[model samples]
Target: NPFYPIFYYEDFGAVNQGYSVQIVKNTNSQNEAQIGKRVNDIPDAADSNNEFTEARPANRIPANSARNQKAIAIVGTSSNTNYELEAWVTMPIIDVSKNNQYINADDTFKYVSFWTEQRYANGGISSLEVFISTDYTNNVTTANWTNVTSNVNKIATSGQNPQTYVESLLDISSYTDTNFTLAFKYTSDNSTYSGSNRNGTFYISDVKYFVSDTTL
Candidate 1:
C-alpha cells in the first residue's frame, strides 16, 4: 500500500545516492517492508550502488503482465509476457502514528487513480495489476493483483494511451471503504521495471479521480 501515489511524500528527500525515502507504515499494514532484523521487512534491493550510480526512484506506471500469472479483466495497453515494471514513491510510506484512512459508500469520495507511463509492450505479455495493498516483501498472498485487487476503486493510466490514467470509481456500497497503504506492483520478467532487461520507456504523468457506478 505504501507504493500508492497518495501515500507519497510530496517533499521527500533522499540520504543515499541509490535509494532513500521514508518507509511507510511498517506495522501490521506492511510487514513485508519491515526493517532489517525485524519482522517481514524487505530490504529494498531497488536502489543504486557501486554497480548502480544512476539508480533512482521509479515512477508508478500502469501494471503489466509479462509472465502473465493469475490475471483478471484486462484493459488499456500493456505488455503481457516476460516484463517487469518500475514504481516511484514521491514520499516514503513511513508514518506509524497516522491511522489508516478508509473510504466508505456513504462518503462523497468514491474513486482512486494512478499516474502512469508505459514501460514495455512485450506483445506476448501476460498479466498486470494496478492496485494497492500491504503485501510487499512476499508478505502478500500472491505476486499478481488478482490475488487482492478487489480493493481497487478508480484507476487510470497514461501508461498506454491515446489517453491519460487514474484508478476507476469503486463500488464501495458492498463493503465499507477502509484506509490502506497505497501500492502498485508491475511484473514483466522479460521487461522488468528495474534491474535491466527492459526496452520500453515508462514515465509518471498525472492522476485524476472521478465517480462511477460499476464493479471495478
Candidate 2:
C-alpha cells in the first residue's frame, strides 16, 4: 500500500492555514453577515442572534466528526432587510513552479478537491462559486479572478437541512499559470418583499491540491 503525497491540503482543524475571509455588501447595510469558522449549531433563520463575529469550531452536524469538528462557514442571512452580500474565503498562495513537479506525463491528472455542504436550505437564495487568481495581492478586491464554477460540482440551492458534506473537484491541469491561488465566493440575497426573509448557511472543509495517475 504505497501512498502518494498531496501537494497541498488543509483540514482547518484548529487553524485557518493562512486562509482569510472577506465580505462585500452589495445591497443594504448588514454588518452581521460573515464568513469564518463556526463551532456552534447552524442557525435556522436570518437574524442577528445567529450571526457570527469570528471563526469557531463546527459541531452542528455528524459530518463534523470527519472534519475534525471544524470547517469554514458563511452566514449570509444575518438580516432580513432585502440584503445582498458576497462572502469570500481565499487560500494561501501556491507556487506552481515548485508544486508542479508531480504533474508529469505518467501522473498528469491535477485538480483541486474539497468538501462542502448547505446546512440551512430555507434561508434564501445562496450560491457558491470557485475562482482563481494568478497575480493576487493580499487584497481580494484588487486581484483579478476568473470564474471556474463550471469545473466543479455546486452546492444545492434547496435541499435537506444540515445535509452531509459532498466532495467536489475542479480540474486544473489546463491552467498555465506558474503561481496561483484559489477562492470560494459565496453570494447570497434575500430581497423578496418588505418583511419577507430568505438566506442560507454553507460550510467547507478538507481542501486538497494534488495530482493523480488516474482521471477523476
Measured by TM-score, the strongest candidate is 2
Candidate 1's displacement at residue 53, Å, is: 36
**Model 2 agreement with the true structure over 1-216: per-residue lDDT tens digits:** 011335665445555554777776556665543556654432223322333223323321212333343468776555444357787889877754434553445556678877666755454466778899999868789999999888786443544434556667888876656768899898877666332245566777656677777787
Model-by-model lDDT, in order?
A: 0.28, 0.62
Give me the overall lDDT of model 2.
Answer: 0.62
Residue runs of model 1 more than 4 Å from their true location after superposition: 1-109, 134-179, 191-199, 204-216
Residue 86 in model 2: shift from native, Å?
0.8
Residue clash pairs of candidate 2: 37-56, 39-57, 123-198, 123-199, 124-198, 124-199
**Candidate 2 similarity to native, TM-score:** 0.71
Q: Can you write out model 1's per-residue Cα lDDT over 17-92, one digit (the tens) per residue? A: 1112233222222222211111111112331112212222343212211211110111212232232323222212
